[PDB]
Each structure stands twice: as structure tokens, then as C-alpha cells.
């Protein structure tokens, strides 16, 4: 994606890295408080592009 | 309305501390002096005892 | 901050507070495995 892209160029990606850990736990965290096994597709992309 | 050890030690303890704490002044009690006191309540039965002591005193 | 910094009132559950004594009149402390959701979760 562009974010990527742009992350790179001016520099600094570990901020899109830990914003990107920060979301994924976050969508855990309400993947675990109702019971729901399957991660979603968002997440499977976070993880990805991480 | 019930006692155990714990109410009762909470309520020992809370008694001390206050009692110290209005010892180094830091503690402002207004609010429980004046409606323990009640300068409304007191002027009411100043003005009751009057009327009763004249009511006494005008039977005779 | 300058003044008094309690303010006792004759209220018991803010006087009681004020000087720590908050929980020590209560039986027992309130905590998170007590609900059956959180058990059905874990």
C-alpha cells in the first residue's frame, strides 16, 4: 500500500510498525472478549504488512 | 448494623486519625460544628423555653 | 492546597474516605472472576 511507500521515504516506519502491533492487539482483544475464533481479514492483512 | 473486627478496628482507627489530624489543624469540621450546634436550632428553643417559662409564670 | 486539604462532613462514607478508611467497611473487595461472562470467556 501507499502508507508503506510513504513511511519509507520520509522516513521512519517503526511507527507504522508499532501503530500497526497496537491495532492488531487491540482487534484481539475484541476477538477474545466474545468468543470468536477465526481472525478476520483485517487482521490477517495487519499481520502481513507487518 | 452489624460489627466485626474489621468495622470495628476501621472505626478505632478513624476516630484516632481524625482526633489527630484537627490536633495539626488540617481539618476543617464546619459543616459537622454547625449542624451539631445549629445556631437556628438553638435560637427555636431559646424562643421555646421563653414561652414556656411565660406560661409558667403567668399561671400563678 | 492552602487550606485544609479534608473537610470532614457529616456524611461517613466521605469523611471515612478522606482519611484512607475507604474499603475496611465493606466485606469483601469487588474483583473481575466473580461475573459468569468473564468465567464463559476464559
Do not use: W
Not at chain 1, 19 to 45: A, Q, Y
Not at chain 2, 12 to 37: A, D, G, P, Y
Not at chain 2, 45 to 57: G, I, P
Not at chain 3, 24 to 32: E, G, H, I
Amino acid at each position: 500500500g501507499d502508507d508503506e511507500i510513504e513511511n519509507f521515504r520520509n522516513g521512519t516506519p517503526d511507527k507504522l510498525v508499532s501503530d500497526s502491533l497496537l491495532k492488531l492487539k487491540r482487534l484481539r482483544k475484541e476477538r477474545i472478549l466474545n468468543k470468536v475464533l477465526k481472525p478476520t481479514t483485517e487482521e490477517r492483512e495487519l499481520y502481513f504488512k507487518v | 448494623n452489624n460489627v466485626t473486627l474489621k468495622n470495628l478496628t476501621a472505626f478505632q482507627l478513624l476516630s484516632q486519625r481524625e482526633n489527630i489530624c484537627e490536633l495539626l489543624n488540617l481539618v476543617e469540621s464546619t459543616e459537622r460544628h454547625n449542624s451539631i450546634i445549629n445556631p437556628e436550632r438553638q435560637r427555636m428553643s431559646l424562643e421555646e423555653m421563653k414561652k414556656m417559662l411565660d406560661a409558667l409564670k403567668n399561671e400563678r | 492546597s492552602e487550606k485544609k486539604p479534608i473537610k470532614i462532613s457529616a456524611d461517613f462514607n466521605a469523611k471515612a474516605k478522606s482519611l484512607g478508611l475507604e474499603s475496611k467497611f465493606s466485606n469483601a473487595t469487588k474483583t473481575a472472576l466473580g461475573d459468569p461472562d468473564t468465567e464463559i470467556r476464559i
